[model samples]
Target: FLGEEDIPREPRRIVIHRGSTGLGFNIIGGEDGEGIFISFALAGGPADLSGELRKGDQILSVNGVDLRNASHEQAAIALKNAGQTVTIIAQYKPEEYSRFEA
Candidate 1:
């Protein structure tokens, strides 16, 4: 469970339908003792260049496939199996986002 501002809502959906590349970021599951979050973003990676994904962003789904209770492996496989392109729905915690601001 996350904080009040961390609650799920209408997430921002991002589509990575260009270039033969992966999401360019790592993801962890909620049950992985870290919650579903963007572990890191490869510098100049697709996700990073897109300006959609950032470290600590909580993934909600992959290509509309809900990952609310998915395991780390499950989420990883989803992204991998999504082919060269994928769509990600995610949310960002205010606190986490603030960290980057400073």
Candidate 2:
């Protein structure tokens, strides 16, 4: 779950951390050529527009624009439009996070 402070008032670029090479590296990838961003929060991390999304889902469309067809600028706008309490679709991909477990 994302902490109350995790959600940003302004758009923030978060760097997904990873463990040592032996451990793993966080590599969240897109499905069907759609861009993907992964975070620790299990709520709305996976889907594009999620109303309680997860961490392993694929973002389909943003503000009704199919990601595959959206330009970089359009995609950014779409993401912003989702806002808090978003609605999103789910898709699956194989990726790993590289972080050292204490």
Candidate 3:
């Protein structure tokens, strides 16, 4: 379950979408940075980006540090600082956008 505080609302919106199946979905970061996993059936929510963050792309860094090596504390800080136009380098997954629609 996500809280209002967990949702980013400045530069973009991270909205929760209800799934008919009722099983929660997750956006998983890849193992060994292979790629980010977006489960379509489990995905209805949207994390709006400033035409920056894209799917299949690697999150080389969050804020500034490489996410692969960031500690939990460091990762937490990076997530907290994620603001509008959050610059990120990733492979675009345009097909995944449909899951977010009403």
The CA lDDT of each predicted structure is: 0.67, 0.36, 0.37
TM-scores for all candidates: the values are: 0.69, 0.36, 0.34
Question: Model 2, which residues run further than 4 Å from truth?
Answer: 1-34, 42-50, 69-74, 83-86, 95-102
- Candidate 1 minimal-lDDT segment of 10 residues: 92-101
Per-residue lDDT of model 3, residues 1-102, tens digit only? 345653232332223222222233324443344433333332332332213333433334544555554443444345556554233334334333333332
- Candidate 1, 1-102: lDDT as tens digits: 445753555578886644346656776554542346677788778767775777767777777687777777878777777875677876766554444446
* Candidate 2 lDDT, 19-72, residue by residue in tens: 111112122333443454333343223332223333543445544456544443
- lDDT sort, best first: 1, 3, 2
Q: Which 10 consecutive positions of candidate 3 have the poorest summed lDDT?
A: 13-22
Residue 71 in model 1: lDDT: 77
- Give the Å shift of residue 50 in candidate 2: 7.9
Candidate 1 structure lDDT: 0.67
Candidate that would win on lDDT: 1
TM-score for candidate 2, residues paired by index: 0.36
RMSD of 2: 14.5
lDDT of 2 at 92: 44
lDDT of 1 at 7: 59
